[model samples]
Target: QSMRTECNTARGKGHMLIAYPGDCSQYISCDSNDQSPQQCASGTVFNSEKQRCDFRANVPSCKV
Candidate 1:
């Protein structure tokens, strides 16, 4: 006797995550109307490598 099984995986927007530069220490708050670089968050100083935040999910199935 033989058995076969198939499964599918899908990622929805719900599995995504977003993080602002301010989330890192390298960023600083700026004035609402400030155009000067100093007023902007020091994003370059921190997270120079640029980090990513993500949402993840797991799906599992079994057959016998």
Candidate 2:
């Protein structure tokens, strides 16, 4: 199991608030704090349009 870290990030504004799962880059991300983890299903990502986990290919704004 992956070790979960919970922290917070504050930016000037308009931060990309979605959490990136399975990316080591997440180490630099804010801790989840008391919030429930945002889990993207396998092979999918957070769809900003739908605001839900969806296929990355369908969401152009999604990063791998």
Candidate 3:
């Protein structure tokens, strides 16, 4: 299965959006206070060492 995640770099406020397709089991965060880079799925993992999601890929940009 595949999923689509979106992120926005706003002024003083950034957020991440994700579209999950299946069940997840883990939760992770890229930042404290749960701001910006948030887990959009259940089994989402953030690699603090890498400073990014465990499963990240490059996809096309969204217009909406």
Candidate 4:
């Protein structure tokens, strides 16, 4: 239920972005010690490959 743990695990490796489970419109950006929750604008979704919120169709794994 909490995402901080995931961020903590990546502390030593470096900042990273993680997709929210089952939710295509939101994502988490994790730094060495903290994380920030981000939201995609309407009709957009988090694109793991691009590392940004992009057009829904660009993310094939996320259902439209």
Candidate 5:
């Protein structure tokens, strides 16, 4: 995903987490106005609901 517009809403809004489309293991982190790419542990997926890395089954947004 393009990092350019991903952090737009997060900028000046404090910290935020953005889900990676189609890929549950990965996520985008926005700290202040800076953007960073991150990944969850091997068996876990990024959970937008919990805002943390959690079991794959726990993340309903992730198909797998």
Candidate 6:
């Protein structure tokens, strides 16, 4: 149910989203040098509602 690591498509132990300190933003991430963060379409961040990087039209802004 949480980030085991998002470095790869490996779901069982891969879901580690990362960012810098005090950074005020939201979305999925996995900077493992080998893997890169998913390039979601512009103006539309990763949609937690659909649990996929989709357009803002369907994704509802969430409150972390």
- What TM-score would every model get versus the actual structure? 0.15, 0.22, 0.18, 0.20, 0.20, 0.21
Candidate 4, residues 1-64, lDDT tens digits: the string is 7565575554654432433343433332331113223334233554333344465565544335
lDDT of 6 by residue, 1-64 (tens): 8997777765644433433332214333321122344434234554333345446574644536
List the candidates ranked by TM-score, beginning with the highest: 2, 6, 4, 5, 3, 1
By lDDT rank, best first, the candidates go 6, 5, 4, 3, 2, 1
Candidate whose lDDT is highest: 6
Q: Write the per-residue lDDT of candidate 2 for residues 1-64, one digit (tens) a residue.
A: 7655534434535744443445523422222222234433333443222334355564544445
What range of 10 consecutive residues in model 6 has the weakest lDDT sum? 24-33
Which regions of candidate 1 fall more than 4 Å away from where they truly are? 1-16, 20-32, 36-64
Could you give candidate 5's per-residue lDDT for residues 3-60 as a string of tens digits? 7666566565454243334343333233112322343423355433334446556554
lDDT of 4 at 12: 52
The 10-residue segment with the lowest total lDDT in model 5 = 27-36
TM-score-best of 2 and 5? 2
Q: Please write out the lDDT profile of model 3 over residues 1-64, one tens digit for every residue.
A: 6645434424433332232423342333433324454544334444333334454552222335
**Model 5 CA deviation exceeding 4 Å by range:** 1-21, 24-37, 41-44, 47-50, 59-64
Clashing pairs in 2: 6-31, 6-32, 7-31, 7-32
lDDT of 4 at 6: 75
Comparing 1 with 5 on lDDT, the higher-scoring candidate is 5
